[PDB]
Write an enzyme that holds these catalytic residues in place. Sequence first.
Site, PDB file in Angstrom:
ATOM      1  CG  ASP A  31       2.387   1.853  10.381  1.00  0.00           C
ATOM      2  OD1 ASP A  31       2.502   3.109  10.565  1.00  0.00           O
ATOM      3  OD2 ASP A  31       1.575   1.419   9.598  1.00  0.00           O
ATOM      4  CG  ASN A  35      -3.881   7.619   8.639  1.00  0.00           C
ATOM      5  OD1 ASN A  35      -4.598   8.393   9.288  1.00  0.00           O
ATOM      6  ND2 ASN A  35      -4.308   6.948   7.542  1.00  0.00           N
ATOM      7  CG  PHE A  80       0.103  -2.436   2.766  1.00  0.00           C
ATOM      8  CD1 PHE A  80      -0.838  -2.629   1.765  1.00  0.00           C
ATOM      9  CD2 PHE A  80       0.498  -3.549   3.521  1.00  0.00           C
ATOM     10  CE1 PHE A  80      -1.442  -3.871   1.512  1.00  0.00           C
ATOM     11  CE2 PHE A  80      -0.063  -4.802   3.252  1.00  0.00           C
ATOM     12  CZ  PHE A  80      -1.016  -4.981   2.244  1.00  0.00           C
ATOM     13  CB  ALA A  81       4.559   2.232   4.483  1.00  0.00           C
ATOM     14  CE1 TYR A 149      -1.878   7.795  -2.557  1.00  0.00           C
ATOM     15  CE2 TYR A 149      -3.367   7.865  -4.459  1.00  0.00           C
ATOM     16  CZ  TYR A 149      -2.800   7.164  -3.383  1.00  0.00           C
ATOM     17  OH  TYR A 149      -3.134   5.865  -3.079  1.00  0.00           O
ATOM     18  CB  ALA A 216     -21.683  16.092  -0.034  1.00  0.00           C
ATOM     19  CB  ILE A 217     -24.156  12.666  -4.238  1.00  0.00           C
ATOM     20  CG1 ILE A 217     -24.855  11.778  -3.191  1.00  0.00           C
ATOM     21  CG2 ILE A 217     -23.472  11.864  -5.341  1.00  0.00           C
ATOM     22  CD1 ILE A 217     -25.703  10.634  -3.684  1.00  0.00           C
ATOM     23  NE  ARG A 292     -13.624  13.401  -4.649  1.00  0.00           N
ATOM     24  CZ  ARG A 292     -13.553  12.334  -3.838  1.00  0.00           C
ATOM     25  NH1 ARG A 292     -13.696  12.431  -2.531  1.00  0.00           N
ATOM     26  NH2 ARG A 292     -13.352  11.131  -4.309  1.00  0.00           N
ATOM     27  CG  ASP A 295     -14.268  12.905  -7.888  1.00  0.00           C
ATOM     28  OD1 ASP A 295     -13.252  12.544  -7.334  1.00  0.00           O
ATOM     29  OD2 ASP A 295     -15.390  13.072  -7.214  1.00  0.00           O
TER      30      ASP A 295
HETATM   31  N1  LIG Z   1      -7.373   2.758   0.775  1.00  0.00           N
HETATM   32  C1  LIG Z   1      -7.404   3.245  -0.452  1.00  0.00           C
HETATM   33  O1  LIG Z   1      -8.438   3.809  -0.806  1.00  0.00           O
HETATM   34  C2  LIG Z   1      -6.242   3.147  -1.373  1.00  0.00           C
HETATM   35  C3  LIG Z   1      -6.435   2.898  -2.845  1.00  0.00           C
HETATM   36  C4  LIG Z   1      -5.164   2.408  -3.452  1.00  0.00           C
HETATM   37  C5  LIG Z   1      -4.001   2.545  -2.853  1.00  0.00           C
HETATM   38  N2  LIG Z   1      -3.903   2.387  -1.476  1.00  0.00           N
HETATM   39  C6  LIG Z   1      -2.589   2.300  -0.903  1.00  0.00           C
HETATM   40  O2  LIG Z   1      -2.358   1.196  -0.085  1.00  0.00           O
HETATM   41  C7  LIG Z   1      -1.520   1.589   1.003  1.00  0.00           C
HETATM   42  C8  LIG Z   1      -2.290   1.392   2.313  1.00  0.00           C
HETATM   43  O3  LIG Z   1      -3.436   2.242   2.295  1.00  0.00           O
HETATM   44  P1  LIG Z   1      -4.478   2.230   3.500  1.00  0.00           P
HETATM   45  O4  LIG Z   1      -5.908   2.568   3.333  1.00  0.00           O
HETATM   46  O5  LIG Z   1      -4.379   1.130   4.462  1.00  0.00           O
HETATM   47  O6  LIG Z   1      -3.684   3.521   4.155  1.00  0.00           O
HETATM   48  P2  LIG Z   1      -3.418   3.645   5.705  1.00  0.00           P
HETATM   49  O7  LIG Z   1      -3.247   5.073   6.153  1.00  0.00           O
HETATM   50  O8  LIG Z   1      -4.478   3.033   6.546  1.00  0.00           O
HETATM   51  O9  LIG Z   1      -2.055   2.859   5.705  1.00  0.00           O
HETATM   52  C9  LIG Z   1      -0.825   3.653   5.769  1.00  0.00           C
HETATM   53  C10 LIG Z   1      -0.085   3.234   7.028  1.00  0.00           C
HETATM   54  O10 LIG Z   1       1.309   3.531   6.941  1.00  0.00           O
HETATM   55  C11 LIG Z   1       1.813   4.281   8.026  1.00  0.00           C
HETATM   56  N3  LIG Z   1       2.816   5.193   7.442  1.00  0.00           N
HETATM   57  C12 LIG Z   1       2.610   6.273   6.545  1.00  0.00           C
HETATM   58  N4  LIG Z   1       3.789   6.777   6.025  1.00  0.00           N
HETATM   59  C13 LIG Z   1       4.767   6.055   6.695  1.00  0.00           C
HETATM   60  C14 LIG Z   1       6.162   6.076   6.531  1.00  0.00           C
HETATM   61  N5  LIG Z   1       6.799   6.933   5.716  1.00  0.00           N
HETATM   62  N6  LIG Z   1       6.843   5.166   7.275  1.00  0.00           N
HETATM   63  C15 LIG Z   1       6.174   4.264   8.056  1.00  0.00           C
HETATM   64  N7  LIG Z   1       4.898   4.133   8.219  1.00  0.00           N
HETATM   65  C16 LIG Z   1       4.215   5.065   7.524  1.00  0.00           C
HETATM   66  C17 LIG Z   1       0.543   4.931   8.540  1.00  0.00           C
HETATM   67  O11 LIG Z   1       0.673   5.087   9.925  1.00  0.00           O
HETATM   68  C18 LIG Z   1      -0.498   3.820   8.353  1.00  0.00           C
HETATM   69  O12 LIG Z   1      -0.449   2.792   9.378  1.00  0.00           O
HETATM   70  C19 LIG Z   1      -1.046   2.984   0.675  1.00  0.00           C
HETATM   71  O13 LIG Z   1       0.113   3.118  -0.133  1.00  0.00           O
HETATM   72  C20 LIG Z   1      -2.176   3.543  -0.185  1.00  0.00           C
HETATM   73  O14 LIG Z   1      -1.542   4.471  -1.109  1.00  0.00           O
HETATM   74  C21 LIG Z   1      -5.086   2.431  -0.767  1.00  0.00           C
HETATM   75  O1  LIG Z   2     -18.261  12.008   0.251  1.00  0.00           O
HETATM   76  C1  LIG Z   2     -18.056  11.530  -0.837  1.00  0.00           C
HETATM   77  C2  LIG Z   2     -16.955  10.764  -1.255  1.00  0.00           C
HETATM   78  C3  LIG Z   2     -16.933  10.191  -2.456  1.00  0.00           C
HETATM   79  N1  LIG Z   2     -17.903  10.405  -3.410  1.00  0.00           N
HETATM   80  C4  LIG Z   2     -17.796   9.774  -4.730  1.00  0.00           C
HETATM   81  O2  LIG Z   2     -17.566   8.407  -4.514  1.00  0.00           O
HETATM   82  C5  LIG Z   2     -16.697   7.807  -5.508  1.00  0.00           C
HETATM   83  C6  LIG Z   2     -15.585   7.180  -4.711  1.00  0.00           C
HETATM   84  O3  LIG Z   2     -14.784   8.324  -4.303  1.00  0.00           O
HETATM   85  P1  LIG Z   2     -13.780   8.019  -3.165  1.00  0.00           P
HETATM   86  O4  LIG Z   2     -14.084   6.945  -2.210  1.00  0.00           O
HETATM   87  O5  LIG Z   2     -13.130   9.194  -2.511  1.00  0.00           O
HETATM   88  O6  LIG Z   2     -12.632   7.197  -4.114  1.00  0.00           O
HETATM   89  P2  LIG Z   2     -11.681   7.644  -5.165  1.00  0.00           P
HETATM   90  O7  LIG Z   2     -11.887   8.925  -5.822  1.00  0.00           O
HETATM   91  O8  LIG Z   2     -12.448   6.760  -6.143  1.00  0.00           O
HETATM   92  O9  LIG Z   2     -10.039   7.249  -4.813  1.00  0.00           O
HETATM   93  C7  LIG Z   2      -9.621   6.178  -3.874  1.00  0.00           C
HETATM   94  O10 LIG Z   2      -9.286   5.108  -4.702  1.00  0.00           O
HETATM   95  C8  LIG Z   2      -8.348   5.557  -5.679  1.00  0.00           C
HETATM   96  C9  LIG Z   2      -8.296   4.470  -6.755  1.00  0.00           C
HETATM   97  O11 LIG Z   2      -9.571   4.257  -7.417  1.00  0.00           O
HETATM   98  C10 LIG Z   2      -6.968   5.874  -5.117  1.00  0.00           C
HETATM   99  O12 LIG Z   2      -6.361   6.687  -6.119  1.00  0.00           O
HETATM  100  C11 LIG Z   2      -7.024   6.625  -3.779  1.00  0.00           C
HETATM  101  O13 LIG Z   2      -5.890   6.174  -3.036  1.00  0.00           O
HETATM  102  C12 LIG Z   2      -8.313   6.312  -3.018  1.00  0.00           C
HETATM  103  O14 LIG Z   2      -8.441   7.030  -1.820  1.00  0.00           O
HETATM  104  C13 LIG Z   2     -16.301   8.956  -6.430  1.00  0.00           C
HETATM  105  O15 LIG Z   2     -16.905   8.971  -7.780  1.00  0.00           O
HETATM  106  C14 LIG Z   2     -16.654  10.223  -5.569  1.00  0.00           C
HETATM  107  O16 LIG Z   2     -17.060  11.347  -6.388  1.00  0.00           O
HETATM  108  C15 LIG Z   2     -19.004  11.177  -3.074  1.00  0.00           C
HETATM  109  O17 LIG Z   2     -19.933  11.443  -3.790  1.00  0.00           O
HETATM  110  N2  LIG Z   2     -18.984  11.714  -1.820  1.00  0.00           N
END
Ligand SMILES: NC(=O)c1ccc[n+]([C@@H]2O[C@H](COP(=O)([O-])OP(=O)(O)OC[C@H]3O[C@@H](n4cnc5c(N)ncnc54)[C@H](O)[C@@H]3O)[C@@H](O)[C@H]2O)c1
Ligand SMILES: O=c1ccn([C@@H]2O[C@H](COP(=O)(O)OP(=O)(O)O[C@H]3O[C@H](CO)[C@@H](O)[C@H](O)[C@H]3O)[C@@H](O)[C@H]2O)c(=O)[nH]1
Length: 338
Positions: A31, A35, A80-81, A149, A216-217, A292, A295
Amino acid sequence: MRVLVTGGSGYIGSHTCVQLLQNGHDVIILDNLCNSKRSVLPVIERLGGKHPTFVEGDIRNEALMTEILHDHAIDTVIHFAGLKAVGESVQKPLEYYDNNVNGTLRLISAMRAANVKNFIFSSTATVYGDNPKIPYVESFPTGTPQSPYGKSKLMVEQILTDLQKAQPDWSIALLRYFNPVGAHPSGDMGEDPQGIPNNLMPYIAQVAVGRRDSLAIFGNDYPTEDGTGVRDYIHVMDLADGHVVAMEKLANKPGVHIYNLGAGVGNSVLDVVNAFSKACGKPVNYHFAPRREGDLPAYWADASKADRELNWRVTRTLDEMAQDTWHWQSRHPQGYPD
Ligand SMILES: NC(=O)c1ccc[n+]([C@@H]2O[C@H](COP(=O)([O-])OP(=O)(O)OC[C@H]3O[C@@H](n4cnc5c(N)ncnc54)[C@H](O)[C@@H]3O)[C@@H](O)[C@H]2O)c1
Ligand SMILES: O=c1ccn([C@@H]2O[C@H](COP(=O)(O)OP(=O)(O)O[C@H]3O[C@H](CO)[C@@H](O)[C@H](O)[C@H]3O)[C@@H](O)[C@H]2O)c(=O)[nH]1
Ligand code: NA
Ligand code: NA
């Protein structure tokens, strides 16, 4: 097995690392902490009941990755990075393509050099694009994500699929996450976003803990039961578990294994708010705001494939997801220490 968990100190990667260690695998975290913080490592340690090796570095560093892989006799890699702030990805595209697309490519490129051929990718439900067919099925074709993204994820899924084909001994899993929430039951680990949370739950937790005024919804005029947006929320522990099985079952099994990771049920904003209100013993303040950008109204997973093929399925409820998040937030209001 010997696994390299990139982004291992991150949010989802930290819980997966705990569970990998509980199953006695040798874990090596990589890592760059853009973040995340070291302060998690010890916790990962404790909860994992074993010591994971940590290396601070960047996935874009081909030579380092290639060294790490060789040095540690890596069997498989969990990637996951990367960067995942949708909104910022719209302001700073370039940095998203560089860390996600190029970062991935550097990583896999090194894998290829070290003779590493088992891989697990952190994908998204966004790859499906604006698909009116719900729930989402792996056999649906992919669409066109609204964000850089979204796009970097999909592009990586194409690159990985194209590689797999040229190098057919590779085992690549495309784990499409839905809406991961929650925390370690201990309340000692949890999501720790810096700044304003972009996600529902953290936001909620933040209002609850009293740092914020109102949630905020974003929209109330959607074509849903209650008019708010619907998503498939999945506890991070479930997520982790799944990653552990994928890795254990898929190793050395040639092909591109696509799996959706979700609870396969939909919950609306108010629903989540209500679960949270209940868990924290008080009414969560919220108000309605406009839609948003980007969305989608509602969507959830069809997670039958993971079930059949990996025998995996979510065992935690919406309630716990809220409870465990509240526990964490409430026990570590400042997050992980500096
Ligand atoms: N959490 C979600 O809502 C969401 C939904 C689907 C996808 N994911 C994916 O899963 C993975 C993990 O997500 P998460 O919530 O734990 O994110 P996170 O920020 O908590 O995890 C990312 C981690 O990677 C490190 N990092 C970022 N870029 C780097 C790089 N180039 N080299 C090395 N380290 C690096 C950051 O410091 C952090 O520790 C990501 O790819 C994210 O796209 C999560
Ligand atoms: O303050 C907030 C935040 C979210 N929402 C709503 O809550 C739902 C969830 O939104 P949010 O948690 O931000 O999730 P996502 O839009 O659903 O996206 C997340 O999950 C996605 C996959 O579903 C991935 O593309 C991204 O990595 C990830 O951050 C949505 O309908 C939003 O409109 C609100 O009303 N208010
Ligand atoms: Na702009
Ligand atoms: Na944030």
